[PDB]
Scaffold this active site. Sequence first.
Site, mmCIF file in Angstrom:
data_model
loop_
_atom_site.group_PDB
_atom_site.id
_atom_site.type_symbol
_atom_site.label_atom_id
_atom_site.label_comp_id
_atom_site.label_asym_id
_atom_site.label_seq_id
_atom_site.Cartn_x
_atom_site.Cartn_y
_atom_site.Cartn_z
ATOM 1 N N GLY A 45 0.786 -1.223 0.000
ATOM 2 C CA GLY A 45 0.000 0.000 0.000
ATOM 3 C C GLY A 45 0.817 1.271 0.000
ATOM 4 O O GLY A 45 2.012 1.273 0.315
ATOM 5 N N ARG A 46 0.156 2.358 -0.369
ATOM 6 C CA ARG A 46 0.768 3.668 -0.375
ATOM 7 C C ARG A 46 -0.130 4.638 0.387
ATOM 8 O O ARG A 46 -1.343 4.658 0.182
ATOM 9 C CB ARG A 46 0.987 4.134 -1.818
ATOM 10 C CG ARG A 46 1.387 5.586 -1.967
ATOM 11 C CD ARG A 46 1.325 6.027 -3.418
ATOM 12 N NE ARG A 46 2.469 5.539 -4.187
ATOM 13 C CZ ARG A 46 2.527 5.512 -5.519
ATOM 14 N NH1 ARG A 46 1.503 5.939 -6.248
ATOM 15 N NH2 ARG A 46 3.610 5.050 -6.126
ATOM 16 N N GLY A 47 0.472 5.410 1.287
ATOM 17 C CA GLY A 47 -0.208 6.517 1.955
ATOM 18 C C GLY A 47 0.324 7.832 1.415
ATOM 19 O O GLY A 47 1.054 7.847 0.422
ATOM 20 N N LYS A 48 -0.041 8.940 2.053
ATOM 21 C CA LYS A 48 0.502 10.243 1.662
ATOM 22 C C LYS A 48 1.913 10.440 2.205
ATOM 23 O O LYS A 48 2.664 11.278 1.713
ATOM 24 C CB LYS A 48 -0.415 11.405 2.085
ATOM 25 C CG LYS A 48 -1.002 11.303 3.489
ATOM 26 C CD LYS A 48 -1.514 12.661 3.962
ATOM 27 C CE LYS A 48 -2.404 12.527 5.184
ATOM 28 N NZ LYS A 48 -2.656 13.849 5.827
ATOM 29 N N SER A 50 4.077 7.548 3.084
ATOM 30 C CA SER A 50 4.921 6.375 2.926
ATOM 31 C C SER A 50 4.411 5.327 1.932
ATOM 32 O O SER A 50 3.251 5.348 1.511
ATOM 33 C CB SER A 50 5.130 5.712 4.289
ATOM 34 O OG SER A 50 3.923 5.137 4.754
ATOM 35 N N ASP A 155 -4.834 8.075 15.570
ATOM 36 C CA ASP A 155 -5.330 7.564 14.281
ATOM 37 C C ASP A 155 -5.890 6.149 14.454
ATOM 38 O O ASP A 155 -5.608 5.241 13.662
ATOM 39 C CB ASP A 155 -4.233 7.663 13.196
ATOM 40 C CG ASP A 155 -4.790 7.576 11.771
ATOM 41 O OD1 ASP A 155 -6.004 7.823 11.561
ATOM 42 O OD2 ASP A 155 -3.993 7.270 10.855
HETATM 43 C C1 18E Z 1 -0.036 1.403 5.894
HETATM 44 C C2 18E Z 1 0.831 1.164 7.102
HETATM 45 C C3 18E Z 1 1.389 2.246 7.794
HETATM 46 N N1 18E Z 1 2.177 2.117 8.889
HETATM 47 C C4 18E Z 1 2.514 0.920 9.437
HETATM 48 CL CL1 18E Z 1 3.539 0.827 10.870
HETATM 49 C C5 18E Z 1 1.976 -0.293 8.779
HETATM 50 C C6 18E Z 1 1.114 -0.213 7.591
HETATM 51 N N2 18E Z 1 0.789 -1.498 7.235
HETATM 52 C C7 18E Z 1 1.357 -2.408 8.075
HETATM 53 C C8 18E Z 1 1.299 -3.793 8.107
HETATM 54 C C9 18E Z 1 0.598 -4.555 7.182
HETATM 55 C C10 18E Z 1 0.620 -5.945 7.319
HETATM 56 C C11 18E Z 1 1.338 -6.569 8.348
HETATM 57 O O1 18E Z 1 1.354 -7.920 8.456
HETATM 58 C C12 18E Z 1 2.058 -5.839 9.293
HETATM 59 C C13 18E Z 1 2.068 -4.459 9.205
HETATM 60 C C14 18E Z 1 2.795 -3.729 10.148
HETATM 61 C C15 18E Z 1 2.841 -2.338 10.109
HETATM 62 C C16 18E Z 1 2.138 -1.699 9.096
#
Ligand code: 18E
Length: 330
Positions: A45-48, A50, A155
């Site tokens: 995935g992508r956020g704003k 990261s 959040d």
């Molecule tokens: C979009 C996003 C933003 N920040 C964090 Cl720390 C995470 C994130 N997805 C994940 C994760 C997605 C799947 C996972 O098994 C573990 C994760 C552990 C941390 C974060």
Amino acid sequence: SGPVPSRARVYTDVNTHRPREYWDYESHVVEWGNQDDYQLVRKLGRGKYSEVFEAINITNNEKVVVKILKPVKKKKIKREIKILENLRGGPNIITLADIVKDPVSRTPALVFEHVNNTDFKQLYQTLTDYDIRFYMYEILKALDYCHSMGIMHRDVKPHNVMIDHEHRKLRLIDWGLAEFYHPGQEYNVRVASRYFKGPELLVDYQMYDYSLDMWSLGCMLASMIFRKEPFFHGHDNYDQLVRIAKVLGTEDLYDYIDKYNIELDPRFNDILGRHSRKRWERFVHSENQHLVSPEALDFLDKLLRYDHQSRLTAREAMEHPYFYTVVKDQ
Ligand SMILES: Cc1cnc(Cl)c2c1[nH]c1c3ccc(O)cc3ccc12
């Protein structure tokens, strides 16, 4: 002559008694690991702020998650890192396993323990009454821990609660908005996701605290027990408060803003209206009734309060009769 100040009713002074280094993240010196340890596998995935990748730690062959940062407010970097380091080993807090410099972005990459999550849109249609109580208690463990450490998440939402339903395991993730609580400090109201924003945010009250997270948790609870996603469905941040007032009523909203001597944005003059407080039974029907109980409604009612000072704290929430049926481990 402006707004009346507010303080958390719990863990008020935890940071003030700590050495500068605990909360002064700007002065933190980052410890770097070796980026060659990690091989990116899948973009998740992508956020704003990261990009997030599934990866493998090539040394132990264990699955891992890599978050590659890039803010404009670059101080967010050291804040997120220090918070994650401070909270490491806490109940149900995602574990930061390493911090490496990404060769391509030339920015820090955070490396986390892996969790085998199920999609919340999918999972929130399967959860039994028992499973809702169980998972709520697990989230509370995480929130009480971080609040006790002088940190608010800011959040809390289903996307940020990763659940391994097969092993009945849960982690609270994405600490990029998290902040240290200092009594009397004014904070940015542009935090949390729309549907989970507390009334303090929506009326532009800056001296908020840990209790913000308890509103957000209440929104999650309401969405689960009533099978309505999201519970408060605003079109924008202004309509968001209107949606809330249609359930909690406008008289208690004015009572809240009058207590703290806050003035609503005059934008509300012609959209807020006049609404009674609804009884929670309004939202019960034949498809969600198996998830609703007097305990559920009472617990929900005590989270979803306009006045941030009146909400259950995390610890008080774990004391609630709602959790009496839940087997505690161990
Ligand atoms: C979009 C996003 C933003 N920040 C964090 Cl720390 C995470 C994130 N997805 C994940 C994760 C997605 C799947 C996972 O098994 C573990 C994760 C552990 C941390 C974060």
